[PDB]
C-alpha cells in the first residue's frame with residue numbers, strides 16, 4: 001500500500017516543460033533564455049533536471065494569456081496580478097501562466113520575465129510564499145543568487161542534489 | 165519559507181457525505197446502496213463512520229458528470245478515465261466525481277459503481293495507489309463476478325496505518 | 331456564399347436532447363416526463379421535433395449540478411439562481427443546467443421542474459426574456475397553456491409548424 | 495418577447511485588431527505579416543480598414559492557445575479543429591483563436607497561418623461557410639502551393655453583400 005506524501009511535490013526528479021506560446025514583448029530566444037535560467041536557479045540546488053519539450057504534454061506547461069485563459073484565475077489587465085502557477089500535481093498541476101497585459105522584459109523596465117518566472121517555478125515545484133522580504137518566494141515583486149530561505153525551502157522538498 | 169503541506173488524513177473519525185446528483189444508469193436506491201456499501205468497506209476496519217446528508221456541504225461531496233464538470237480535470241467520454249477523487253482536506257478535499265459517460269451498474273456490465281466508489285473513497289481517505297495487483301487500491305479495474313467483496317489485506321493495512329483498527 | 335442568419339436559432343428542425351444526470355428530488359420517470367412535456371410545449375406550436383438520446387452528444391445537453399459545474403455561470407446554493415440555458419449554437423449552445431441545491435418537484439412545492447425547464451428550453455431555442463408578466467419567458471418564476479407572447483416569439487423564429 | 499438578434503455586420507468600417515500572443519512556430523515578424531495579409535484579403539475588396547493596436551482592447555482580439563483556453567470551446571490537440579472565430583459583436587465578437595497544437599507556417603507545411611487566418615477573419619466579419627468548393631469560406635482546408643492568393647469570386651460576393659465594394 002501507499003499513503004500520499006506529506007507535502008505537494010513531484011515524485012520524480014526529471015521534469016519537462018513546454019513554452020506553449022510567446023509574449024509579443026520579447027524575442028523567442030529571449031523568452032527561452034529567461035525560462036532556462038529560471039529553471040537553473042532551482043536545478044542548481046536540488047537533484048531536479050528540466051528538459052524542454054517543443055510539443056505535447058509537459059509536466060510544466062507555460063503560457064501567456066490575458067483575462068480568462070482556461071482556469072479559475074482570470075487575469076486582470078495591466079498591473080495587479082502578474083502571473084500564477086499551480087502546485088505539483090496532474091494536469092494543470094505545475095503549470096505557469098503569465099499575464100500578457102503586463103510588459104515582459106529582460107531588463108529593469110516593466111516586469112523582468114526571468115525573475116517572475118523563477119518565482120512562479122518555485123510554486124510549480126511546491127513552494128508557497130515566504131515571510132522573508134529578501135526571499136525569491138516573498139509575495140511582492142521587486143527587481144542572481146537564490147536567497148538562502150528559498151534554498152532551504154526547495155531542499156526540504158527535494159534534497160540538495162550534488163552539493164558541489 | 166512555506167511548502168504546501170498535505171492533509172495526510174481526516175482529523176475527525178465521523179465524516180459526512182452527500183450524493184449531489186444521480187446517474188441515469190441505476191435507480192436512486194441502487195446508487196445509494198452502492199455508495200453505502202463502498203463506505204462500509206472502510207468503516208468496517210477503522211474507527212471511521214459515515215453519515216449521509218441530503219442538503220448543504222458534506223465532507224465528501226459525490227457527483228456524476230461528463231467532460232468539463234467544474235474542476236478543470238475533465239472527463240473523457242466512454243472508457244479511459246472512470247472517476248477521480250481529491251485527497252483529505254477542506255472544500256474539494258475528499259470529493260468524488262464519476263464519469264457518467266461510463267455505464268454504471270450493480271453487476272459485471274460496464275463498471276460496477278460500488279467497486280469503483282470503494283476505490284475512489286480510498287483516495288478520499290488518504291490512500292494512494294498500491295503496487296499489489298490484488299489490492300482494491302491497485303490502479304487497474306478488474307471485476308471478480310462474485311456477489312461478495314472482501315477488502316484485501318494490503319488495503320486493510322494501508323487504511324489502518326492512517327486511522328488505526330476499528 | 332452564406333452570411334450568418336439574423337437571429338440565434340437552430341438551422342434544423344430535428345433536435346436531440348440528453349438527460350446527462352438526475353436530481354435526487356424526483357424519480358427518473360418523473361424527470362423524464364417533466365422534460366418531455368416541457369419540450370412538447372414548444373413543439374406543439376412550431377415545426378420542431380425533439381428526440382431523446384440516452385448517451386453521446388445531443389444538441390441540448392441537460393444536467394443537474396451545484397456551484398461550479400463547467401462554465402462561467404456557477405450556481406449559488408439554495409435560492410437565487412435556479413437554472414440557466416445557452417442560446418442556440420455549437421458545443422454548450424442550447425444546453426440547460428439546473429441548480430440541484432434547489433428542491434425540484436412535480437408539484438407546487440419547491441420549484442416545479444416542468445415549468446422551469448419549459449422556460450429554460452425557450453432560451454435553448456432562441457428566446458430571451460419577455461416584458462409580459464404572464465409570459466413563460468418572463469424573468470421571474472411564479473407557479474398548461476403556452477402564453478400568446480411566447481407563441482409569437484417562438485414562431486417568429488421557426489414558423490408555426492402544423493397549425494392544426 | 496425578445497429573441498437573440500445577431501449583429502449581421504460591423505457598424506463601422508474602421509476596425510482594430512491586436513495580436514495578444516504568438517506561436518512558437520514562426521517569427522513575430524512572420525506572424526504579423528500573415529495576419530496583415532489576411533486582413534488585406536478583405537479590406538482590398540470593401541470599405542473596411544484594419545488598424546493594429548499593441549495594448550488594450552481591439553475589436554478583433556487574436557491569440558494562440560491549446561485545449562481549454564478561456565471560452566469553453568476547447569481545442570483538441572494536433573489536427574481536427576484548427577482555429578475558430580466569433581461573428582461580429584462586442585466582447586468576444588470578432589475574436590480569433592488559433593490552436594497552437596497545430597504547426598503554423600508560412601508555407602505548405604502544417605497549416606498556412608495566412609490562409610487559415612483569412613478564413614477565420616471571414617467569420618469575424620459575418621461570413622458563414624460557403625458551399626462553393628473553390629471558396630476561401632469553404633469548410634475544408636486545402637493549400638495551392640502558389641505564392642500568390644486571389645480571393646475567389648464567391649467570397650468577394652459574400653463580403654461585398656455585407657459591406658459593399660471598396
Ligand SMILES: CCOc1ccc(-c2ccc(S(=O)(=O)N[C@@H](C(=O)O)C3CCN(C(=O)OC(C)C)CC3)s2)cc1
Nearest residue numbers: 073081082083084085086115116119136139140141142
Ligand atoms: C525578489 C522577489 O521576486 C519575486 C518575483 C515575482 C513575484 C510575483 C509574481 C507574481 C505575483 S502576483 O502578485 O501575481 N501573485 C501570484 C503569485 O504570487 O505568484 C498569485 C499566485 C496565487 N494565485 C492564484 O491564482 O493561484 C492559482 C495559481 C492556484 C493568485 C496570484 S508576485 C514575487 C517576488
Ligand SMILES: CCOc1ccc(-c2ccc(S(=O)(=O)N[C@@H](C(=O)O)C3CCN(C(=O)OC(C)C)CC3)s2)cc1
Nearest residue numbers: 237245246247248279280283299300302303304305306
Ligand atoms: C479491485 C480493483 O478495484 C478498482 C476499482 C476502480 C479503479 C479505478 C477507478 C478509477 C480509475 S481511473 O483510471 O480513472 N484513475 C483515477 C483513479 O485511480 O481513481 C485517477 C485519480 C486521480 N486523477 C485526477 O485527476 O485526480 C484529481 C482530481 C486530483 C486522475 C484519475 S481506476 C481501480 C481498481
Ligand SMILES: CCOc1ccc(-c2ccc(S(=O)(=O)N[C@@H](C(=O)O)C3CCN(C(=O)OC(C)C)CC3)s2)cc1
Nearest residue numbers: 403411412413414415416445446449466469470471472
Ligand atoms: C410562468 C413563468 O415561468 C417561469 C419559469 C422559470 C423561470 C426562471 C428559471 C430560472 C430563472 S433564474 O432566476 O435562475 N435566471 C436565469 C433564467 O432566467 O433562465 C438566468 C439565465 C441567464 N444567466 C446565465 O448564466 O446565462 C448563461 C446561460 C449564458 C443567469 C441566470 S427564472 C421564470 C419564469
Ligand SMILES: CCOc1ccc(-c2ccc(S(=O)(=O)N[C@@H](C(=O)O)C3CCN(C(=O)OC(C)C)CC3)s2)cc1
Nearest residue numbers: 567575576577578609610613629630632633634635636
Ligand atoms: C481555400 C480554403 O481555405 C480554408 C482555410 C481554413 C479553413 C479552416 C480553418 C479552421 C477550420 S475548423 O475545422 O477548425 N472549423 C472552424 C472554422 O470553420 O473556422 C469552426 C468555427 C466555428 N467553431 C466554433 O466552435 O466557434 C465558436 C467559437 C462560436 C468550430 C470550428 S477549417 C477552411 C478553408
Ligand SMILES: [Ca+2]
Nearest residue numbers: 043044046161
Ligand atoms: Ca542539481
Ligand SMILES: [Ca+2]
Nearest residue numbers: 077078079081
Ligand atoms: Ca495584470
Ligand SMILES: [Ca+2]
Nearest residue numbers: 059091092093
Ligand atoms: Ca502540469
Ligand SMILES: [Ca+2]
Nearest residue numbers: 100101102103
Ligand atoms: Ca505583454
Ligand SMILES: [Ca+2]
Nearest residue numbers: 223255256257
Ligand atoms: Ca470535501
Ligand SMILES: [Ca+2]
Nearest residue numbers: 241242243245
Ligand atoms: Ca471516461
Ligand SMILES: [Ca+2]
Nearest residue numbers: 264265266267
Ligand atoms: Ca452513464
Ligand SMILES: [Ca+2]
Nearest residue numbers: 373374376491
Ligand atoms: Ca409542431
Ligand SMILES: [Ca+2]
Nearest residue numbers: 407408409411
Ligand atoms: Ca440557487
Ligand SMILES: [Ca+2]
Nearest residue numbers: 389421422423
Ligand atoms: Ca449543445
Ligand SMILES: [Ca+2]
Nearest residue numbers: 430431432433
Ligand atoms: Ca435538488
Ligand SMILES: [Ca+2]
Nearest residue numbers: 553585586587
Ligand atoms: Ca472582439
